[PDB]
């Protein structure tokens, strides 16, 4: 089966930058036809993929002129010229020279901005929550960026790490900023014995921790 | 122009047998090229399964354990996927294609052994400038489900986050930033929405 890889897995470009993406084939795509099926999409969040070059260097309706590829052989690249936002996701390249049909790995594609520090927010259990039982304490890191953020939870002081959940957004095309969640949950037990609820967040826009807290 | 469509039964028991639904409109199925059936993966990786040309004759990925066939019917202008006996490991997201140029939206298969649940939601409000609330919905089974908030009037600084697997059960928190001059002399509701259990919510965000 032909293997398709793909270079870099991660890419940051700043706005109005060109950038490039490297697609690496385990076998000639050269079809007896003389051509070379080999095609790219995006993937923007939430959405499907979509072709934007296809057969090597054509180029479907409605995509920009933004967009070309090229290669060699067993090298290909797709060069996005002008670097817009709305570019952000993950890029694929695939092969239909041979069956089975191959996809590569995918490419993120980041958009590079300014560093930009998690406006934090901490929230105490329900009401609802608590009369069922259930303690969850949530934390809301938004609109900070890069992605790179760590997070502590602790009760009276100290720290814990068993009943934590954490899910981070996709990059916002909007600002190019990320946004994460967190959730400790404990049982309605377990919260009613202890006092202090902190939320810690560390991240590249300080050299120290931001602290959002609450008393129970 | 051409349009895909995907429909599917949603959760289903492993070594159920299931099938699932292409419409197409705007192009004849039977007019000309091949018709294919893709998957992605939790971790984002595609696999191409297999299509169905115009002749009504079938092409698959021989590289694969799923046990599988595409059919058709062409006066409804319809293709489909049939999964024989599903296991764990076909969970993921089936999208149909002309070629590779016209995608659907998609359609999520999750097999699991797990029950359906409808979810809690409960009601995130404070304890600046700006002002932030949230939603917790907790403890469903499958999704997808359906946060809004202000019956989607209001969209701008929401920040809904993709759901996280805990013990067979899916939580889901959304965040929103609104001016402090909004809430709570202005209601801010939460609208949650499981067609799954067929359950739909509506939280007000109260404050205290
Ligand atoms: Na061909």
């Known amino acids: 089966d032909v293997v398709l890889t793909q270079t870099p897995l991660s890419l940051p470009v700043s706005l109005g930058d060109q950038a490039s993406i490297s697609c690496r084939s385990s076998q000639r795509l050269v079809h007896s036809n003389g051509n070379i099926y080999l095609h790219w999409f995006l993937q923007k969040p939430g959405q499907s993929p979509k072709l934007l070059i296809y057969k090597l260097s054509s180029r479907f309706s409605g995509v920009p002129d933004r967009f070309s590829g090229s290669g060699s052989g067993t090298d290909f690249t797709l060069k996005i010229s002008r670097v817009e936002s709305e570019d952000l996701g993950i890029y694929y390249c695939?092969?239909?020279?041979?069956?089975?049909?191959?996809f590569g790995g995918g490419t993120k594609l980041e958009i590079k901005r300014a560093d930009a520090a998690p406006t934090v927010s901490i929230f105490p259990p329900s009401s609802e929550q608590l009369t069922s039982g259930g303690a969850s304490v949530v934390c809301f890191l938004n609109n900070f960026y890069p992605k790179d953020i760590n997070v502590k939870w602790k009760i009276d002081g100290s720290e814990r790490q068993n009943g934590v959940l954490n899910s981070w957004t996709d990059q916002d095309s909007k600002d190019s900023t990320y946004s994460m969640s967190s959730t400790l949950t404990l049982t309605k037990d377990e919260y009613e014995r202890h006092n202090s609820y902190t939320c810690e967040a560390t991240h590249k826009t300080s050299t120290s921790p931001i602290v959002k807290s609450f008393n129970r | 122009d051409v349009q895909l469509q995907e429909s599917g039964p949603g959760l289903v028991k492993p070594s159920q047998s299931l099938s699932l639904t292409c419409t197409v409109t705007?192009?004849?199925?039977?007019?000309?090229?091949?018709w294919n059936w893709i998957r992605q993966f939790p971790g984002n990786k595609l696999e191409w399964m297999g299509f169905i040309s115009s002749y009504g004759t079938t092409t698959y990925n021989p590289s694969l354990k799923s046990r599988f066939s595409i059919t058709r019917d062409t006066s409804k202008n319809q293709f489909f996927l049939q999964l024989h006996s599903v296991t764990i490991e076909d969970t993921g997201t089936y999208f149909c294609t002309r070629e590779g140029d016209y995608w659907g939206q998609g359609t999520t298969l999750t097999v699991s052994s797990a029950k359906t649940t409808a979810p809690s939601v409960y009601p995130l409000a404070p304890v600046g400038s700006s002002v932030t609330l949230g939603c917790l919905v907790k403890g469903y089974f499958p999704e997808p489900v359906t946060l809004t908030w202000n019956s989607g009037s209001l969209s701008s600084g929401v920040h809904t986050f993709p759901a996280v697997l805990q013990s067979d059960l899916y939580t889901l928190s959304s965040s929103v930033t609104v001016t402090s001059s909004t809430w709570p002399s202005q209601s801010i509701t939460c609208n949650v929405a499981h067609p799954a259990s067929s359950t739909k919510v509506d939280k007000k965000i109260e404050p205290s």
């Open positions: 705007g192009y004849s199925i039977t007019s000309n090229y091949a």
């Open positions: 695939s092969q239909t020279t041979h069956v089975p049909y191959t």
